[PDB]
Each structure stands twice: as structure tokens, then as C-alpha cells.
Amino acid sequence: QAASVEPYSDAAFTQAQASGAPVLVDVYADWCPVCKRQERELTPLFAQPAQRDLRVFKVNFDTQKAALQQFRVSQQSTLILYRNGQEVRRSIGETSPSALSDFLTR
């Protein structure tokens, strides 16, 4: 009953949606422009009241290689929050109104 984060765990991304609970995904890189520029918005963008009851797993391109190599993902800024087994919102490539819009639905 206190958040829930998983360091690079593609196997969790599915378990989070198959549980019908609030879980958002956030990919990061060694030093990408997204994770480097988002580090400043990580405060307000993650200060929401629903950010406490909303799980967040941080996956790295070093672990999701099979994902970026299979889906051709040359960037770590994907986002997808499932609410009770339903896709709320999603956005890739730095923050955006479509990426945070998922927080309004937890």
C-alpha cells in the first residue's frame, strides 16, 4: 500500500495491466534528451495526487532491448497507464498532454 516501482521489468508491464490496477510505464536511457530534460518535470509531473496510488515502472533500453529491437524503438520515452485493464492514455517523445492525460484517470 505504498507505490510500486520495478527497475527494467518488461514482464511486469503485462502483470500490471493484467491485475486491473493503476500502473504507468516510463522508459529511460543512459543520458537521453527526454530523461535528461524530463528530470526537471519529474517533480511536478510526478507530484500529482494520483501519482501515489499509481504504480510506475522504469524500464531501460538495456533491458527492453528485445522490445526496442523487435518494435524498432530508438527512444525511451514511451508511456502507457492501464486502468482496470484498459488503456487510458499514451505518448512517446518527451513529456506531453497525451502522456500526462493518463494521470487524470489513474
Domain extents in the chain: 1-106
CA gap 91, 95 in Å, rounded: 8
User: What kind of experiment solved this structure?
Assistant: NMR
E-strand spans in 10-93? Answer: 23-28, 55-60, 80-82, 87-90
Question: 36-52: string of b/e by CB count within 10 Å (b at 16+)?
Answer: eebeeeeeeebeeeebe
